[PDB]
């Protein structure tokens, strides 16, 4: 019964471990975890927590590139909040439209 009930706890604990490792790497880059996840999904790059933690451990240059992307989209969102747009709605905004 413990072996059957352990599968849900395994999935939950693995995602909490990924959240801890991504928080560690982003806080090495001076970024918080919510800023990284939110502003990464706002550039339409859909990387899940598993490959983000694996990029954090094994490919730290690609993680620095991702942290720079998330910070730039964060800054664009802040300037858009001060200006309501007008002109450019940023550059690393402007989502690609699919039909």
């Amino acid at each position: 019964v413990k072996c059957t009930k352990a599968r849900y706890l395994k999935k939950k604990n693995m995602r909490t471990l990924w959240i801890n490792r991504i928080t560690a790497a982003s806080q090495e880059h001076g970024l918080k975890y919510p800023a990284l996840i939110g502003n990464l999904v706002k550039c339409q790059v859909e990387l899940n927590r598993k490959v983000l933690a694996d990029l954090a451990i094994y490919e730290p240059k690609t993680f620095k590139s991702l942290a720079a992307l998330a910070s730039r989209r964060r800054h664009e969102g802040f300037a858009a909040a001060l200006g309501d747009g007008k002109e450019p709605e940023g550059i690393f905004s402007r989502v690609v439209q699919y039909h």
């Binding site: 880059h29 001076g30 550039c43 790059v45 730290p60 240059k61 690609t62 620095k64 590139s65 942290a67 720079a68 992307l69 910070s71 730039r72 800054h75 550059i91 690393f92 402007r94 690609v96």
Partner: protein, 108 residues
């Protein structure tokens, strides 16, 4: 000018968006440690074994370091050496010893 992260550690990123708009390009060459951020290697050359009478008395002196302690002080010494507590360095029973994998799996 504006860079989103400091560009002194690990890497130097430039972020680029394609003219099509459909792929983000990141260029990141590694940064080396330049020469003036390194101290030179210390060269320890300590030699005080030479007394003028013999020459192989120093080779005799080479094996003069032996010590015996009982379990208590040895555990205290290992604890203050490796910055752990005392509970590691005690043994275990036969039951905990003989159910441990001696041929564990090896990834990579």
């Amino acid at each position: 000018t504006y860079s989103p992260l400091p560009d002194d550690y690990n890497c130097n990123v430039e972020l680029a968006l394609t003219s099509d708009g459909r792929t983000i390009v990141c260029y990141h060459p590694s940064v080396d440690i330049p020469y003036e951020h390194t101290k030179p290697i210390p060269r320890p050359d300590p030699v005080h074994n030479n007394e003028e009478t013999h020459d192989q008395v120093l080779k005799t002196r080479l094996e003069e370091k032996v010590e015996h302690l009982e379990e208590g002080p040895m555990i205290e010494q290992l604890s203050k050496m490796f910055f752990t507590t005392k509970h590691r360095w005690y043994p275990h029973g036969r039951y905990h010893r003989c159910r441990k994998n001696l041929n564990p799996p090896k990834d990579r």
